[PDB]
Amino acid sequence: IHMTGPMCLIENTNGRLMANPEALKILSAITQPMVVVAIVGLYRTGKSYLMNKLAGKKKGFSLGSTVQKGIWMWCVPHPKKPGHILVLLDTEGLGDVENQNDSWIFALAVLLSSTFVYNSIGTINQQAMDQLYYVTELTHRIRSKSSPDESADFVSFFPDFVWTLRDFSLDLEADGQPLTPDEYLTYSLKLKKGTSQKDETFNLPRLCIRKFFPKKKCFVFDRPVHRRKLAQLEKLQDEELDPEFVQQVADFCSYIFSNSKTKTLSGGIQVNGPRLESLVLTYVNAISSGDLPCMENAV
Numbered sequence: 001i002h003m004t005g006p007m008c009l010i011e012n013t014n015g016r017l018m019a020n021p022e023a024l025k026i027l028s029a030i031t032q033p034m035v036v037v038a039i040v041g042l043y044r045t046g047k048s049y050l051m052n053k054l055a056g057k058k059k060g061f062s063l064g065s066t067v068q069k070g071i072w073m074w075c076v077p078h079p080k081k082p083g084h085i086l087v088l089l090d091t092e093g094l095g096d097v098e099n100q101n102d103s104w105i106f107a108l109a110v111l112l113s114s115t116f117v118y119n120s121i122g123t124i125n126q127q128a129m130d131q132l133y134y135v136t137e138l139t140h141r142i143r144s145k146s147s148p149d150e151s152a153d154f155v156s157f158f159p160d161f162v163w164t165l166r167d168f169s170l171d172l173e174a175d176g177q178p179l180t181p182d183e184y185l186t187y188s189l190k191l192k193k194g195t196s197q198k199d200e201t202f203n204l205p206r207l208c209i210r211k212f213f214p215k216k217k218c219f220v221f222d223r224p225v226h227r228r229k230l231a232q233l234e235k236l237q238d239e240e241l242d243p244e245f246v247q248q249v250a251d252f253c254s255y256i257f258s259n260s261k262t263k264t265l266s267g268g269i270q271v272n273g274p275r276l277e278s279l280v281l282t283y284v285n286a287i288s289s290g291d292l293p294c295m296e297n298a299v
């Protein structure tokens, strides 16, 4: 499975989402079952490191990928599942230079993925909650535009949720024992107690995550601390980064290689390369159509 590095699967150009033919021929060739893990988030938040580490790459921490966008893929063998492939998706360029296909790229990632990894800096903020809410419903509207006819049946389709918090080497709070990353999640996910229309327009995203993301793991990561940029524009190695950061991101990878399920369609048919090509074309066609059937909401 040659793939030395990542490759764009869906490119964002002129506000126009175009699926990659070169990427589709690759997917087609892979007959084995797939575990799709989408590392989504804002640009320049350290997503690439999770990708390289997940792809098994030893030297995978770049330092400034200076310029002078869409969904990139990386198909490697699954390091804990022989006969299974690991497809890695990355939402490139989200909010970089900034119709704004950010939500759509976000949605396709969640759609195509078997596991959903949201990557953000600092403490959990409303802005993240709102778009997480927005994508949940957006994915509902797109998936529904593919169903043979014009709700515990949509929750079964949704991927697992993983939140990776970055530069949040802070994460210091407790009751009597220090909070775990997981406990921090539920905490920052606690609903506001108030019969108001400000707390209402605050608890909706929380309520949405409560229903649509049943399995939820959280990861807090330390600030990556390393030797100075010895001649700029390079790619460091683990032995040159904060040992804690390396161990944290490894413990993350381990959770992925073990807990992440094989991508399945409706009826429970495992998804393989050619099956993912179909899903990429279907979903790109459902979006690029500018159609979208207006059915009832799902919140």
Ligand SMILES: Nc1nc2c(ncn2[C@@H]2O[C@H](COP(=O)(O)O)[C@@H](O)[C@H]2O)c(=O)[nH]1
Pocket: 042, 043, 044, 045, 046, 047, 048, 049, 061, 062, 063, 064, 065, 093, 121, 166, 167, 221, 222, 223, 224
């Ligand atoms: N703030 C922050 N940047 C990181 C971290 N890990 C890697 N980076 C940097 O963030 C950039 C990665 O961009 P990305 O893949 O999220 O679009 C690279 O320039 C890399 O040097 C991290 O944990 N926190």
